[PDB]
Design a protein around this ligand. Structure first.
Ligand SMILES: [Zn+2]
Ligand SMILES: [Zn+2]
Ligand SMILES: [Zn+2]
Lengths: 60, 150, 109, 79, 97, 94, 60, 94, 109, 80, 98
DNA sequence: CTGGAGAATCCCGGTGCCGAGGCCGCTCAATTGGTCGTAGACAGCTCTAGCACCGCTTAAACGCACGTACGCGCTGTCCCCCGCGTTTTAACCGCCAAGGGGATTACTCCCTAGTCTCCAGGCACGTGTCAGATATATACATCCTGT
DNA sequence: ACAGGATGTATATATCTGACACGTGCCTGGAGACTAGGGAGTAATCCCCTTGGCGGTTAAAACGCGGGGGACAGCGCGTACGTGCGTTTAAGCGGTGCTAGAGCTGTCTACGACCAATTGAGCGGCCTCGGCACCGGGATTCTCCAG
């Protein structure tokens, strides 16, 4: 339960360490980096757009 | 067990086994786990009632980051399906999310069955028949339902 | 009296003019004949590129707390994206300026 | 005549500053105002040939844009 | 009184001019230079104001790019002061000489 | 009273489609027009040149496909091809 | 240890569900709103100053 | 059994006219053929671009001369336009 | 039985083919109409350029004391003349080699 | 056909450098020379294969290679 | 007594030798293997013309020779005679390839 | 700095070959001659914009003095590259075999050019209002020198 | 490292303003329907050249070792360039006036596309010999080390 709770929900492989400041959802950083550099600049959860400055490293 | 996409498909299969949504089912092809065969029941309160729709879905190793290719096997009469079974949906081309799984895909397809999207008239004939004549449209839908049982 | 006219751009789900692109292709002396789907494909590609640059420029303008896109915002958006920078590597944008960067050697320490 | 001196030392300094230069040696102003006039000659010659092919007496911004494009220096914002 | 050490005003100027977008050369001397250069191709040509502006945009962009390249050269030579050797090296590498 | 063509209207619609509440300067519109014309020239010239290589007299969607693959780099090319294919399929179906 | 890591370091009783936008430390809700209403725009971690627009809700 | 055209004959005649007692390798002839094709393509493209710029539908000798002036540098361009004018004058007189 | 056919190249006093140039211009899809003097002018220019390069290459071969022109001689002729070097600065010549030159710093002293 | 980049041997790279007029060569040059050559080949071969597959044939031709090179502003003479 | 040249003399001699000849400097068969390996990533089971492979090899050698001339100029500019990867990186960055 | 030894380079001569060069069908591409539709040359009117000038402000270029930070020369060191001999590897040449695929030709059919009609999207023209620049009084961060 | 003064620098508020986003008349170019013909898709067949394999030679690659030369760090000196301030200077802005030429329109004629018939010149093939690369041998020269 706790593992899945604190694991990134889109990949479910590794740990949450990033927040998208537009929608304030939390994902893991490299999912975010990949969706950006592959130009799907869109929130996986709430479908909100974001730029290079709307996501940052977080530590939980 | 080798790839994250394969493992994601493994959880997809186990969830479909343990708690499938209403009127849907799925299984891998025996010799190719990338191939997914699914059966969808027509939504209640819709002309698609009593339908047993066969589905085939093809995945690659970059799942869940990309929407897969989903194709109807039985003949279908839906404004948003091409004559071959090509499927044009929001989560399938435009607003795919890696959080979505095969169960979510099947539920979304069943939702489309009730609510065709007018922005994607893949079958122009079906779109027109839905748009101005519901009676013969649902007659056609009953025809495809009785045809899907075989 | 024939039928309600529908534009090809509307038929293809695009905002760019398919007919105008077709006219430019046929008048631009590129080839003797022009296919039916060629203007559709070209208009779609142009629309996608325009949308991409506009989206990045809007993000850049928002990052400066401005609501109007100017050539400076366009320049920032193009030069901050690697693929757009590669596509427009030999293009000068009037009144666009440059990206603010300083070599680490020059920085005081 | 003698208009190359209009490209002044402070103007060159601020161009270098935009380029990112910390300090500039004193022999660069003569070098750069020669480089500039070479570049200008190359562009203006093509622009004037375009104009005279068009049988005109005024050089137009579109002619200048064409001349720049002929050298792989496409410029946006003038037509 | 107050006195800034060399290198601080220069850094402030770099930050300032890398943020703004105006033309860094005075308009009339540049216009006279263009008219002077063009007069050896044909006599008493006329110019559009937009044409002169396009020329000035191109010239400033070219010079700024050249100065970035010459700064890279000077840094590569273990220096911080650019010198005409640096400009010549940049020009030769870019195939203009 | 000459009539001159530009892409201003379509650029404006695309802008309000992407950023619903963002404007654009007049000078930026000129740059967008120049960019659109430049990309159109590049792609059309490359497609015509391909048709000439293959001893063909008609520019169809295949040459535009290949020209986009040749010009646009990487992920841009991938997405542009995806968009063009979708538009052509939509146009043929309707 | 999971509950301890998931709990705020200010009170050590309540779940960490908010971050401070410029310094990016994660704390509780009422802990930061009480600090702000008491005028102490002050991080217990990095002492950073903040304003009314420098914090927002975040959900797991 | 397709037939392909080249400028080998004319290049050889020009060589015999310039150096009457000098030969040329087969591989050098390929380079000369590529060079001639390259220059032809350059000048033709530049002339077509001029014609489009001036809203003209015909490629005359004036466009060719202007394109030669644009491409060839300096004294080479002067001599080239001199030979072109001489040849066109002789042709019109004939 | 009209008249003895005089080639347009002979009329213009050129060795290069004028008819072939005209056919390539008309077939090359450069413009819908082609002037009468354009092929003549183009053929003259091509002939002059070919003559220039061939003369330089022959001089280079005679310098090396050979009687045939090879790609090495063509490359030497191209890279030695400043005008031709500028004209063909972005051209690779197969089996051409490079100009023999060594920077003065490297030489011992 | 795996790990063939090592076929571009150290003596071959030195010979190329000598033709370039290089007197002394550092020991680290070889790796980025391999990398630069690999980048150049990927750039050219991608376009060549694009031309080939557009022509609907399985054979890459010297003509396609010449076209790809010309598309990068480095036209090559002597191959048609 | 063994005879040894001073370090640099034979280097200059071989610069003179290779700046006079025109043969290909990379071994043809390994170059072809490398080309096929790289092309394997775009289309499987491709076939290559020998002339196409030769054209590739010629282009690459020309490109590398030009790059090395630029690198040598950069190294000399740095007041040294040995080329190091920073020189190659500077040359490629100035030419606009990176 | 001035001479021999040695290795590298240059010059001369005979030889064999294969690639350049001339010769012969012949077939298609260049030539010749009308024909006609129109694109471009040319005269004329206009009114837009480029050129020229004058006066006032003041922002900017100019010139001087100082000091200090950086360019440059000199020196030591040591390590990393080069020259070389020996051994190992695989490039290369020669030959042979199978066949995949490139290069033609025929046939047809469907897709695109061309034409006529029409009507609605987009363009020039007006117009008010809000995004942004500017002036001003702040709170705050940053450099510089003394500590 | 630390702290306070001085100077740019970020911040919030108020206000003008002029450029942009919306609305409207209208007009011309895009859409619809139709017809005609040829561009190309498809199938079939031929044979070229590409891939694959095998074996012998040997040239080039790999390894190792000794040495020395050049990259690099460090130090000292001097000069020239940044910084600041006082003094020109002319860029810039406004306002006005003039007219040259860009730009449009309307006429009209030479000129290039098109067609059909004719013929000769360039292409493919096919000999033929000499320019040149190569192997041997002699003469010359550059570089290094001892003097
Ligand atoms: Zn993740
Ligand atoms: Zn979200
Ligand atoms: Zn708390």
């Amino acid at each position: 339960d706790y593992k899945a709770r604190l694991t990134c929900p889109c990949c479910n492989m590794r740990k949450k360490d990033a927040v998208l400041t537009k929608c304030f959802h939390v994902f893991c950083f490299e999912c975010v980096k990949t969706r950006y550099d592959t130009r799907q600049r869109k929130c996986p959860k709430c479908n909100a757009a974001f730029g290079a400055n709307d996501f940052h490293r977080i530590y939980i | 067990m080798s790839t994250p996409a394969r493992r994601r498909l493994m959880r997809d299969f186990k969830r479909l086994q343990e708690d499938p949504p209403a009127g849907v089912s799925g299984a891998p092809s025996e010799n190719n786990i990338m191939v997914w065969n699914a059966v969808i029941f027509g939504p209640e309160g819709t002309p698609f009632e009593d339908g047993t729709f066969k589905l085939t879905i093809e995945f690659t190793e970059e799942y869940p980051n990309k929407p897969p290719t989903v194709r109807f096997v039985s003949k279908m009469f839906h404004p948003n399906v091409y004559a071959d079974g090509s499927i044009c949906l929001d989560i399938l081309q435009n607003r795919w999310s890696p959080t979505y799984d095969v169960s979510s895909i099947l539920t979304s397809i069943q939702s489309l069955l009730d609510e065709p999207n007018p922005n994607s008239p893949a079958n122009s004939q079906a779109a027109q028949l839905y748009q101005e004549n519901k009676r013969e449209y649902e007659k056609r839908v009953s025809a495809i339902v009785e045809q899907s049982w075989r | 009296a024939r039928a309600k006219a529908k534009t090809r751009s509307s038929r293809a789900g695009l905002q760019f003019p398919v007919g105008r692109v077709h006219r430019l292709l046929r008048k631009g002396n590129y080839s003797e004949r022009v296919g039916a789907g060629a203007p559709v494909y070209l208009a779609a590609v142009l629309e996608y590129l325009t949308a991409e640059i506009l989206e990045l420029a809007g993000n850049a303008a928002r990052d400066n707390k401005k609501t109007r896109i100017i050539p400076r915002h366009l320049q920032l958006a193009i030069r901050n994206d690697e693929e757009l920078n590669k596509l427009l590597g030999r293009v000068t944008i009037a009144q666009g300026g440059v990206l603010p960067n300083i070599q680490a050697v020059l920085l005081p320490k | 005549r003698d208009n190359i001196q209009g490209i002044t030392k402070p103007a060159i300094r601020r161009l270098a500053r935009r380029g990112g230069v910390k300090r500039i040696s004193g022999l660069i102003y003569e070098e750069t105002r020669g480089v500039l006039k070479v570049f200008l000659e190359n562009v203006i010659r093509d622009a004037v040939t375009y104009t005279e092919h068009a049988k005109r007496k005024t050089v137009t911004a579109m002619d200048v844009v064409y001349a720049l494009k002929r050298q792989g220096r496409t410029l946006y914002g003038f037509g | 009184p107050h006195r800034y050490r060399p290198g601080t005003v220069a850094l402030r100027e770099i930050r300032r001019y890398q943020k703004s977008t105006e033309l860094l050369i005075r308009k009339l001397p540049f216009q006279r230079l263009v008219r002077e250069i063009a007069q050896d191709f044909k006599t008493d040509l006329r110019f559009q104001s937009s044409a002169v502006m396009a020329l000035q945009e191109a010239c400033e962009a070219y010079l700024v790019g050249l100065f970035e390249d010459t700064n890279l050269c000077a840094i590569h030579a273990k220096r911080v002061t650019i010198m005409p050797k640096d400009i010549q090296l940049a020009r030769r590498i870019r195939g203009e000489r | 009273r000459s009539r001159k063509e530009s892409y201003s209207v379509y650029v404006y619609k695309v802008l309000k489609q992407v950023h619903p509440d963002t404007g654009i300067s007049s000078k930026a519109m000129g740059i967008m027009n120049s960019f659109v014309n430049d990309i159109f020239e590049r792609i059309a010239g490359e497609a015509s040149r391909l048709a000439h290589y293959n001893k063909r007299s008609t520019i169809t969607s295949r040459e535009i496909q290949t020209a986009v693959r040749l010009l646009l780099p990487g992920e841009l090319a991938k997405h542009a091809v995806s968009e063009g294919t979708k538009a052509v399929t939509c146009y043929t179906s309707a």
